[PDB]
Design a protein around this ligand. Structure first.
Ligand code: SF4
Ligand code: F3S
Length: 106
């Protein structure tokens, strides 16, 4: 029951997927989501995200509550990703920029 939040958008390092025991990450053009029902809450992906975008559901910041629901719905429509990939080309420029939800691509 972990959740990918805002800082992932435009960064998408994919450092989180290799440690996932149940392969419950799904990828979008510029963001990743965790499938809530598949996730076993092992917490292993959280410290691996360079963007510090992953949070336990009950620890998702108040201002990013929308991502809980978002991960659930997008996990239904995006393809599963199980292998690390190169971060987006300008990940460092966007890492730390707030409100990147406005840049989310379906
Ligand atoms: S908490 Fe564990 S099972 Fe859930 S997405 Fe992260 S690595 Fe995968
Ligand atoms: S930037 Fe996104 S792709 Fe994974 S390593 Fe962090 S949640």
């Amino acid at each position: 029951a972990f959740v990918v939040t805002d800082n992932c958008i435009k960064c998408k390092y994919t450092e989180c997927v290799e440690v996932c025991p149940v392969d419950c990450f799904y990828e979008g053009p510029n963001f990743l989501v965790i499938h809530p029902d598949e996730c076993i809450d092992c917490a292993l992906c959280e410290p691996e995200c360079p963007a510090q975008a992953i949070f336990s559901e009950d620890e998702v910041p108040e201002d990013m509550q929308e991502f809980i629901q978002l991960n659930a719905e997008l996990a239904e429509v995006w393809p599963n990703i199980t292998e690390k990939k190169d971060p987006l080309p300008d990940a460092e420029d966007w890492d730390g920029v707030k409100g990147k939800l406005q840049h989310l691509e379906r």
